[PDB]
Inverse folding.
């Protein structure tokens, strides 16, 4: 039959909306005729303040994630401590780990990514310490040795360069933030920003949109 | 039967995404059990730069409106001249006119608003000159005298104050930009930003989402 359309998702586990778009795409990956390609990326390679105590956009995000938790049925929870803190700690080791997973055991990438989001954006757990990464990896179903082997590659030139190259690809697609979803279909390439454009994606693909929680 | 839910749309004809959200809402106004309340507002009362020649977000908007023209079937066209120019000229008279229409002939507000968007965001026509406003009003189906009568009220304290008050209401709902859609349902008030959250709105209302172009 006709070849599946490649849909690339560029994401960083530090991004709440990246998780939301990720889950919607994963839900459609065996329904639509697509080749979902996960692209672990680093927001700090892309991103190029209000004096008010409680900025309007910050309030909006807090309210929005509350609604989207229910709408998408994803257990996303705003962190108990300052967002600034999670963000300052960063996701470098985590994204390098996911890059290593992509290179060695791509079939584990989806669950590994989900488990890291579950730490940072569901349970408010650290994702910068080695033990933290390993905990997520083992929850994803990786063996301790497998996870430890991948952990040891986080700082290798190959993994560091792959993450840079993937992040650069996002930039070349016009990314000003994550997530971006890139569909290659009908002889064109389309970049969509955020988690709220999946119905438009469906239309680009000529596929049926059944909402953020499609049936069996 | 149960009372319709009030859904407020705060908009400025200078905003392209306000037009898009407007049309989707107007399409559902007699399908869902809602009382659609149009709220003419002024972006300049709410809004509180990249050195690069062609900023990424500007490219994104250009590409996005191209896709959305087809997805929503709305004849939106990026202006031939600099956006900065349309924006510098502003929409003050136009939004005051629409405020006057809301106060005197609310049943004409939908078409009057549409015709002003058709000028600025479809045909790249001026919306600051009196003759421009009148042209849109007459296209909406207003009599020349009716339109002229409203035009003469643009600078009255009553109209000026109403526009300020409406814009202030948007601010009090947390607006950091337009459009915002405010649904009062199930004992809560929810503010949604932009034109891409209408499926979420449907879910809040317990109504069926049939895409941006619902059937008869």
């Amino acid at each position: 039959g006709p070849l599946p359309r490649t849909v690339e998702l560029f994401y960083d586990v530090l991004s709440p909306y990246s998780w939301l778009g990720f889950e919607i795409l994963c839900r459609y990956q065996n329904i639509w005729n697509i080749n979902l390609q996960l692209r672990p990326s680093l927001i700090t390679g892309i991103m190029k303040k209000p004096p008010g105590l409680l900025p309007r956009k910050g309030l909006y995000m807090a309210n929005d994630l509350k609604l989207l938790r229910h709408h998408l049925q994803i257990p996303i929870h705003f962190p108990k401590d300052f967002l600034s803190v999670m963000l300052e700690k960063g996701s470098l080791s985590a994204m390098r780990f996911l890059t290593a997973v992509n290179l060695e055991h791509p079939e584990m990438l989806e669950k590994a990514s989900r488990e890291l989001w579950m730490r940072v954006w569901s349970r408010n757990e650290d994702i910068t310490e080695p033990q933290s990464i390993l905990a997520a990896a083992e929850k994803a179903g990786m063996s301790a040795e497998q996870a430890q082997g991948l952990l040891e590659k986080i700082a290798t030139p190959k993994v560091k360069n792959q993450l840079k190259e993937t992040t650069e690809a996002a930039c070349r697609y016009g990314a000003f933030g994550l997530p971006i979803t890139v569909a290659h279909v009908d002889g064109q390439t389309h970049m969509l920003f955020g988690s709220d454009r999946m119905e438009l994606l469906a239309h680009l693909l000529g596929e049926k949109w059944m909402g953020p929680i499609p049936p069996a």
Observations:
- Chain A has one domain: 4-207.
- The beta strands of chain A are 5-11, 34-40, 180-185, 188-193.
